[PDB]
Scaffold this active site. Structure first.
Site, PDB file in Angstrom:
ATOM      1  N   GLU A  20      68.426   9.273   7.460  1.00 23.86           N
ATOM      2  CA  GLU A  20      68.556  10.723   7.310  1.00 23.86           C
ATOM      3  C   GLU A  20      69.521  11.077   6.179  1.00 23.86           C
ATOM      4  O   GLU A  20      70.369  11.962   6.313  1.00 23.86           O
ATOM      5  CB  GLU A  20      69.001  11.370   8.621  1.00 23.86           C
ATOM      6  N   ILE A  23      74.780   8.109   3.514  1.00 23.84           N
ATOM      7  CA  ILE A  23      75.237   7.160   2.503  1.00 23.84           C
ATOM      8  C   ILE A  23      76.684   6.779   2.792  1.00 23.84           C
ATOM      9  O   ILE A  23      77.486   7.619   3.216  1.00 23.84           O
ATOM     10  CB  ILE A  23      75.089   7.741   1.083  1.00 23.84           C
ATOM     11  N   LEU A  82      87.120  -0.562   6.373  1.00 26.40           N
ATOM     12  CA  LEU A  82      86.259  -1.238   5.411  1.00 26.40           C
ATOM     13  C   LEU A  82      86.002  -2.668   5.873  1.00 26.40           C
ATOM     14  O   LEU A  82      86.944  -3.417   6.154  1.00 26.40           O
ATOM     15  CB  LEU A  82      86.895  -1.223   4.022  1.00 26.40           C
ATOM     16  N   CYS A  83      84.728  -3.052   5.916  1.00 28.59           N
ATOM     17  CA  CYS A  83      84.300  -4.341   6.442  1.00 28.59           C
ATOM     18  C   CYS A  83      83.567  -5.143   5.375  1.00 28.59           C
ATOM     19  O   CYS A  83      83.077  -4.603   4.379  1.00 28.59           O
ATOM     20  CB  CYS A  83      83.392  -4.165   7.670  1.00 28.59           C
ATOM     21  N   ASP A 126      73.358   3.611  19.975  1.00 32.08           N
ATOM     22  CA  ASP A 126      72.748   2.866  18.878  1.00 32.08           C
ATOM     23  C   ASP A 126      73.536   1.574  18.725  1.00 32.08           C
ATOM     24  O   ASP A 126      74.688   1.593  18.287  1.00 32.08           O
ATOM     25  CB  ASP A 126      72.745   3.675  17.579  1.00 32.08           C
ATOM     26  N   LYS A 128      72.925  -2.458  17.242  1.00 32.02           N
ATOM     27  CA  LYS A 128      71.996  -3.242  16.449  1.00 32.02           C
ATOM     28  C   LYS A 128      72.802  -4.045  15.446  1.00 32.02           C
ATOM     29  O   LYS A 128      73.995  -3.775  15.253  1.00 32.02           O
ATOM     30  CB  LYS A 128      70.994  -2.341  15.727  1.00 32.02           C
ATOM     31  N   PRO A 129      72.198  -5.031  14.791  1.00 33.75           N
ATOM     32  CA  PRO A 129      72.978  -5.862  13.866  1.00 33.75           C
ATOM     33  C   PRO A 129      73.729  -5.068  12.806  1.00 33.75           C
ATOM     34  O   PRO A 129      74.882  -5.403  12.515  1.00 33.75           O
ATOM     35  CB  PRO A 129      71.906  -6.774  13.254  1.00 33.75           C
ATOM     36  N   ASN A 131      75.049  -2.092  12.984  1.00 40.38           N
ATOM     37  CA  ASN A 131      76.192  -1.388  13.549  1.00 40.38           C
ATOM     38  C   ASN A 131      77.267  -2.330  14.076  1.00 40.38           C
ATOM     39  O   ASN A 131      78.365  -1.870  14.410  1.00 40.38           O
ATOM     40  CB  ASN A 131      75.724  -0.425  14.638  1.00 40.38           C
ATOM     41  N   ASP A 149      79.752   2.927  14.479  1.00 42.26           N
ATOM     42  CA  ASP A 149      78.772   4.014  14.478  1.00 42.26           C
ATOM     43  C   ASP A 149      78.618   4.655  15.859  1.00 42.26           C
ATOM     44  O   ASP A 149      77.746   5.519  16.023  1.00 42.26           O
ATOM     45  CB  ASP A 149      77.389   3.599  13.943  1.00 42.26           C
TER      46      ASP A 149
HETATM   47  N1  LIG Z   1      82.367  -0.003   7.604  1.00 43.87           N
HETATM   48  C1  LIG Z   1      81.485  -0.471   6.701  1.00 43.87           C
HETATM   49  N2  LIG Z   1      81.870  -1.309   5.719  1.00 43.87           N
HETATM   50  C2  LIG Z   1      80.993  -1.783   4.814  1.00 43.87           C
HETATM   51  N3  LIG Z   1      79.682  -1.460   4.825  1.00 43.87           N
HETATM   52  C3  LIG Z   1      79.168  -0.627   5.763  1.00 43.87           C
HETATM   53  C4  LIG Z   1      80.068  -0.071   6.777  1.00 43.87           C
HETATM   54  N4  LIG Z   1      79.322   0.710   7.574  1.00 43.87           N
HETATM   55  C5  LIG Z   1      78.046   0.666   7.111  1.00 43.87           C
HETATM   56  N5  LIG Z   1      77.959  -0.135   6.032  1.00 43.87           N
HETATM   57  C6  LIG Z   1      76.718  -0.414   5.269  1.00 43.87           C
HETATM   58  O1  LIG Z   1      75.895   0.752   5.255  1.00 43.87           O
HETATM   59  C7  LIG Z   1      74.537   0.404   5.539  1.00 43.87           C
HETATM   60  C8  LIG Z   1      73.906   1.496   6.388  1.00 43.87           C
HETATM   61  O2  LIG Z   1      74.868   1.974   7.320  1.00 43.87           O
HETATM   62  P1  LIG Z   1      74.522   3.198   8.305  1.00 43.87           P
HETATM   63  O3  LIG Z   1      74.591   4.475   7.505  1.00 43.87           O
HETATM   64  O4  LIG Z   1      75.365   3.022   9.541  1.00 43.87           O
HETATM   65  O5  LIG Z   1      72.982   2.908   8.681  1.00 43.87           O
HETATM   66  P2  LIG Z   1      72.558   1.612   9.547  1.00 43.87           P
HETATM   67  O6  LIG Z   1      72.158   2.191  10.885  1.00 43.87           O
HETATM   68  O7  LIG Z   1      71.433   0.979   8.757  1.00 43.87           O
HETATM   69  O8  LIG Z   1      73.817   0.781   9.618  1.00 43.87           O
HETATM   70  C9  LIG Z   1      74.545  -0.957   6.228  1.00 43.87           C
HETATM   71  O9  LIG Z   1      73.498  -1.809   5.743  1.00 43.87           O
HETATM   72  C10 LIG Z   1      75.918  -1.533   5.922  1.00 43.87           C
HETATM   73  O10 LIG Z   1      75.827  -2.646   5.023  1.00 43.87           O
HETATM   74 MG   LIG Z   2      75.740   1.535  10.932  1.00 47.51          MG
END
Ligand SMILES: Nc1ncnc2c1ncn2[C@@H]1O[C@H](COP(=O)(O)OP(=O)(O)O)[C@@H](O)[C@H]1O
Ligand SMILES: [Mg+2]
Length: 383
Positions: A20, A23, A82-83, A126, A128-129, A131, A149
């Site tokens: 949706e 980003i 940040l991960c 939600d 899943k891998p 999240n 998330d």
């Molecule tokens: N805290 C984070 N640190 C680094 N990358 C992230 C983080 N959260 C989400 N991402 C990146 O953002 C992408 C999409 O995140 P999100 O908007 O939550 O949708 P999704 O449900 O696909 O995770 C993921 O593929 C992930 O690599």
């Molecule tokens: Mg996510």
């Protein structure tokens, strides 16, 4: 370089694209690099009460931190720890690349952080891998996993197709146990899913087409995991164990704990009249579990040593008694016996569980009758 106080991020640093129009960028909340997620308030609504309740309690290390939330005219910004990567990268990564984070302890961290939400009556909705996130190495470089998330509701079904519990499409904490069960198989299977194809997985969930191929029927390690996973993904949500129930499963036990369970069980059954409810339930399964006569399936040195002092051979109880007997008296046994069995606890317990793969899982299910007792509290959730 967009700046919405207090959050600071720059475009072209984008970490990933969500659903949706969501980003996520690399940015800085205060002095520190954070992940900034931009969501459309028309699509996703951020739950302020759920995030505040979690912040006001003791923070769980395996649940991710939401640092700040800021809104501008068009968007809504959220800052999170940040991960390094998501769980998909972990599963797709090579075994040596894991940086010391083991798959079982990873699932444990996930399930523990999930129990911390449920303790607050918060359902992730939600899971899943993507999240489940892998932390950046800290100092010495140890890494953990954090579920993320949570507390995001899609305005007008929540969750991601293929991870959604069947009843939601047909919510309480059992929705998350279902997704977790799929994640559990995903980590163990090294990329496989209980419902194999990406397009038809959610469709299969609705009609219950799940199949676990990667778990061998004859391998103790896989039989324990199979029994746990199938309960989590069970079509009927009332048959799914809670988060704290899962953490007590033999799937998370060490080898010495496995052997310690076998010992503690044998003592309780000693101590039990045959035909009784405990011994009757235990002896029900096998037959097959014990492989007819078990004395035939054990190495000859142990067979001869057992000729001294009467073991049934078609009884799980007698097999458990023999295992307890050789462990307590291990120092007294001839070097021929101790060689084919030990070392203790590891090679000793693996001797029996490898030869009898259903023994631990079978014994575990039959002994749930004692789940409330103080001696079995480590092995079961006492509620
Ligand atoms: N805290 C984070 N640190 C680094 N990358 C992230 C983080 N959260 C989400 N991402 C990146 O953002 C992408 C999409 O995140 P999100 O908007 O939550 O949708 P999704 O449900 O696909 O995770 C993921 O593929 C992930 O690599
Ligand atoms: Mg996510």
């Amino acid at each position: 370089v967009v700046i919405v106080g207090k959050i600071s991020f720059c475009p072209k640093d984008v970490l990933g694209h969500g659903a949706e129009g969501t980003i996520v960028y690399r940015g800085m909340f205060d002095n520190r690099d954070v992940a900034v997620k931009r969501i459309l308030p028309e699509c996703f609504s951020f739950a302020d009460r759920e995030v505040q309740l979690l912040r006001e309690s003791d923070e769980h290390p395996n649940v991710i931190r939401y640092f700040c939330t800021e809104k501008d005219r068009q968007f809504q910004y959220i800052a999170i720890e940040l991960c390094a990567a998501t769980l998909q990268e972990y599963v797709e990564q090579k075994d040596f690349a894991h940086l010391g984070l083991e798959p079982i302890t990873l699932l444990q961290q996930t399930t523990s952080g999930l129990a911390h939400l449920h303790s607050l009556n918060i359902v992730h909705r939600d899971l899943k891998p993507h999240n489940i996130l892998i932390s950046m190495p800290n100092a010495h470089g140890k890494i953990k996993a954090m579920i993320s998330d949570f507390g995001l509701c899609k305005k007008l079904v929540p969750g991601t197709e293929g991870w959604i519990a069947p009843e939601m499409l047909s919510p309480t904490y059992t929705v998350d146990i279902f997704s977790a069960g799929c994640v559990f198989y995903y980590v163990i299977s090294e990329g496989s899913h209980p419902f194999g194809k990406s397009l038809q997985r959610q469709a299969n969930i609705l009609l219950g087409a799940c199949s676990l191929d990667c778990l061998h029927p004859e391998k103790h390690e896989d039989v324990i995991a199979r029994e746990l996973i199938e309960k989590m993904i069970a079509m009927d949500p009332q048959k799914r164990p809670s988060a704290k129930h899962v953490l007590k499963h033999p799937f998370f036990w060490s080898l010495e704990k496995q052997l310690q369970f076998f010992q503690d069980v044998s003592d309780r059954i000693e101590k039990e009249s045959l035909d009784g409810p405990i011994v009757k339930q235990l002896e029900r399964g096998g037959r097959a579990v014990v492989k007819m006569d078990w004395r035939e399936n054990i190495t000859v040195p142990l067979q001869t040593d057992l000729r001294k002092f009467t073991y049934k051979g078609g009884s799980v109880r007698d097999l458990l008694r023999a295992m307890r007997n050789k462990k307590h008296h291990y120092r007294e046994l001839p070097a021929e016996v101790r060689e084919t069995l030990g070392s203790l606890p590891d090679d000793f317990v693996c001797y029996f569980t490898s030869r009898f793969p259903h023994l631990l899982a079978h014994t575990y299910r039959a002994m749930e009758l004692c789940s409330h007792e103080r001696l079995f509290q480590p092995y079961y959730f006492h509620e």
